[PDB]
């Protein structure tokens, strides 16, 4: 009755594995030889943002690369001015349990969410001189993990239950759903063309989705524990993942398999966040041992360290122009490095 | 000064925001926060009614002291991902039903949950308040059914006091950490009016010891 279907699934998996194995002609390290290394990289703190009285959980840069937004365990969303360190806006939240935030690419709206299973959208530019709640989106059954704007009227979300969704802000209803995971979805990343996105769950797997049709395209495996971070290559044809194994990995789409892994014998803790650099030559990772590491993307070499925090590093980000790097931590302080 | 007439106003605005944040932080540090755990069919609703969607909230006051209670029993997700958010609470309240001993086994599930929570790495130095509910039912069943279904090794007498002491010591001997934290046990039923007083006493003791440890006098 059902044994035949399971045997067919096993046969298909074996066929896929053989097909992938046929394309592997040469490893990345072999090609990336006779190329001059990058050398030691030294970067200095330049700013320090203060005024948060709890642990910081998320942050996001603005498209102008001057303004910032950050969230904390206390019910507060603060917007910063990078160059002067001035505070522009402080927004109070109804629920103190928050886990993610986003910045609209136009600069008119912000988004928030957490353990309450709701996504709140706030309007920044109005005619009364205050910030007010513009929309509340509900329908998930688990805590929200991430959210990202596509335009002024579209947003995708990820939930603690095995599902992602696409919303319509005007009507407040869901227009598409993505269900192929068995675990908890922890992160997602959008493509530069805003046509595809990738997800990572607690079953040690990653998936590639199509926004319009709403179907999965490819699945990637190789990790041994939960995946907590994921990011896109600047070109848009590869991505990087980080898990609890204390290792990072690089995956390719056209080849449909893994390319390289970044690990060190003296690192035994998990990874909380991952980011790339303009031109995609440096990979920045945040660890649980109060530090941040810089890796060469084309080589397994480690080209620097970033140690200025007294607790766990929760989040990090790079500007669209590529001038500075921002990091947050559980010590309640955000820093900017250049 | 190298500042135009329009940046000083921004500085003043930022300073007024800082003042507001300070006042907010000061007003939020005068409340005592508690986390309520326990498996289903334990008596959480009874105690909640005796004291005044995802996570749930509750507030009450006693002797000019304000308590907030967090209930997280409606999540139904991986607990290793969002439980570190509660690191920092004053204490934890655990509910267990004495009646459901003969009723794989509910008592063993409660013991497993208690052991898992007590020896967590985020709750190393947080005390625990244990409530044992439905004493009358336990005293109405012990006479008919012996206390050997749960513990085949039991070698005592079919008496309420001895059985209650046996259960209490079995629950109390699961904490590997003995010097860092202490457990406060209490017996209650469906009709009581002195549980909030017990909570108040335990909280005052915990706060005094924490203060006496921050100042290095211990």
């Amino acid at each position, epitope marked *: 009755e059902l044994d035949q279907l399971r045997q067919e699934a096993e046969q298909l998996k074996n066929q896929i594995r053989d097909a992938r194995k046929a394309c592997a002609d040469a490893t990345l390290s072999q090609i990336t030889n006779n190329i001059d290394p990058v050398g030691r990289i030294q970067m200095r703190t330049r700013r320090t943002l203060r005024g948060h009285l709890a642990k910081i959980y998320a942050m996001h840069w603005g498209t102008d690369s001057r303004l910032l937004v950050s969230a904390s365990q206390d019910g507060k969303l603060i917007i910063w001015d990078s160059y002067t360190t*001035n505070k522009v806006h402080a927004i109070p939240l109804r629920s103190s349990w928050v886990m993610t935030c986003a910045y609209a690419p136009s600069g008119n709206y912000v988004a928030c969410g957490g353990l309450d299973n709701i996504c709140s959208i706030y309007n920044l530019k109005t005619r*009364e*001189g*205050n910030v007010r709640v513009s929309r509340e989106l509900a329908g998930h059954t688990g805590y929200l993990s991430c959210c990202r704007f596509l335009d002024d009227n579209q947003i995708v979300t990820s939930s603690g239950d095995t599902t992602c969704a696409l919303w319509d802000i005007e009507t407040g209803q869901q227009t598409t759903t993505f269900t192929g995971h068995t675990g908890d979805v922890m992160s997602l990343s959008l493509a530069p063309d805003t046509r595809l996105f990738v997800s990572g769950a607690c079953d040690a797997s990653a998936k590639l989705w199509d926004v319009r049709e709403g179907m999965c395209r490819q699945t990637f495996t190789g990790h041994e524990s939960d995946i907590n971070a994921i990011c896109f290559f600047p070109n848009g044809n590869a991505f990087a993942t980080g898990s609890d194994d204390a290792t990072c990995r690089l995956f390719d789409l056209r080849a449909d398999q893994e390319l390289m892994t970044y690990s060190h014998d003296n690192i035994i803790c998990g990874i909380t966040s991952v980011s790339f650099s303009k031109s995609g030559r440096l990979l920045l990772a945040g660890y649980d041992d109060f530090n941040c590491n810089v890796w060469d993307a084309l080589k397994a070499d480690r080209a620097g360290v970033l140690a200025g925090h007294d607790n766990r590093v929760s989040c990090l980000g790079v500007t669209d122009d590529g001038m500075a790097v921002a990091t947050g931590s559980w010590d309640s302080f955000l820093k900017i490095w250049n | 000064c190298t500042l*135009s007439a*329009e*940046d000083k106003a921004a500085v*003043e*605005r930022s300073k007024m925001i800082d003042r507001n944040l300070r006042e907010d932080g000061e007003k939020a540090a005068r409340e005592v926060k508690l986390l309520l755990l326990g498996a289903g069919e334990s008596g959480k609703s009874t105690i909640v009614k005796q004291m005044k969607t995802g996570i749930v909230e509750t507030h009450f006051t006693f002797k000019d002291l304000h308590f907030k209670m967090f209930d997280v029993g409606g999540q139904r997700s991986e607990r290793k991902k969002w439980i570190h958010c509660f690191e920092g609470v004053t204490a934890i309240i655990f509910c267990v039903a004495l009646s459901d001993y003969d009723l794989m086994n509910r008592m063993h599930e409660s013991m497993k949950l208690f052991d898992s929570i007590c020896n967590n790495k985020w709750f190393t130095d947080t005390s625990i308040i244990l409530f044992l509910n439905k004493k009358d039912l336990f005293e109405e069943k012990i006479k008919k059914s012996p206390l050997t279904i749960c513990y085949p090794e039991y070698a005592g007498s079919n008496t309420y006091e001895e059985a209650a002491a046996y259960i209490q010591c079995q629950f109390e001997d699961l904490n590997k950490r003995k010097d860092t934290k202490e457990i406060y046990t209490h017996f209650t039923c469906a009709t009581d009016t002195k549980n909030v007083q017990f909570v108040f006493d335990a909280v005052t003791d915990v706060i005094i010891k924490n203060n006496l440890k921050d100042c290095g006098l211990f």
Partner: single-chain antibody
Framework: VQLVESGGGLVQPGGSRKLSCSASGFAFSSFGMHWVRQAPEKGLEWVAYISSGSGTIYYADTVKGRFTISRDDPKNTLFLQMTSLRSEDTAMYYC??????????????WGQGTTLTVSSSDIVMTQATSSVPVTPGESVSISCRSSKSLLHSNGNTYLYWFLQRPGQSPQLLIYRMSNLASGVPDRFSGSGSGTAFTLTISRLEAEDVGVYYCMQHLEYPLTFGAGTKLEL
């Protein structure tokens, strides 16, 4: 959003008077406020200013020690007390809004104004035209020159353009060199450099007729420019 202004009337020399303004429709407690005045036929003239929180106050050199300005935030009112009124104090008074943070637009909303009659090292902004004729559908340009560079080290050029129509209070069009306000069509444009600035209109309608003013916000006491009237 509205600001109503009370008080005013006929006063004898040497008397005293009180003027009040009531606001409704916005967060009155997070805005700074100004007072401006206009003589019966002359241009605009700044008077005084209050910060948000009443932590900073400024006055014009001609009213120092004679006028007082105050605020009341729970009741949403603004007050101006005037003592020892001269014969040069006859004018129409306006109350103005201003909010200061990165990327804001000050001087964006004005009041209706009240009339008061009395019985009988500063930058200079100059305009060298007036009563310029025009026909609908054509393109027009207005010019302005200052007596000092308005360009700051941070890269901002502080210059503002205002339009006043017959029988109406002024309205903001450009709240900084090359920055269009909200709700105003795209016909208007502004450009300049150093100490020379200009405002250009692609095509004008019947409603784009009035007097145009230029203002600087580099430092106090916020001197105004002269008027430039357009005739159909």
């Amino acid at each position: 959003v509205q600001l109503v202004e009370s008080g005013g009337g006929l006063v004898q020399p040497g008397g005293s008077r009180k003027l009040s303004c009531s606001a409704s429709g916005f967060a009155f407690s997070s805005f700074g406020m100004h007072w401006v005045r206009q003589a019966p036929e002359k241009g605009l003239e700044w008077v005084a200013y209050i910060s948000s929180g009443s932590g900073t106050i400024y006055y014009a050199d001609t009213v120092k020690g004679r006028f007082t300005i105050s605020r009341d935030d729970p009741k949403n009112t603004l007050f101006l007390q005037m003592t020892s009124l001269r014969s040069e104090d006859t004018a129409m008074y306006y109350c103005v809004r201003s909010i200061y943070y990165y990327g804001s637009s000050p001087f964006d909303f004005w009041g209706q104004g009240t009339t008061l009659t009395v019985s009988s090292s500063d930058i200079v902004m100059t305009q060298a035209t007036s009563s310029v004729p025009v026909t609908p559908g054509e393109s027009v340009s207005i010019s302005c020159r200052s007596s000092k560079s308005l360009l700051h080290s941070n890269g901002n050029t502080y210059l503002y353009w205002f339009l006043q129509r017959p029988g109406q209070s002024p309205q903001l069009l450009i709240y900084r060199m090359s920055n269009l306000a909200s709700g105003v069509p795209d016909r208007f444009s502004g450009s300049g450099s150093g100490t020379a600035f200009t405002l250009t209109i692609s095509r004008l309608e019947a409603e784009d007729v009035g007097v145009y003013y230029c203002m600087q916000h580099l430092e106090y006491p916020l001197t105004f420019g002269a008027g430039t009237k357009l005739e159909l």
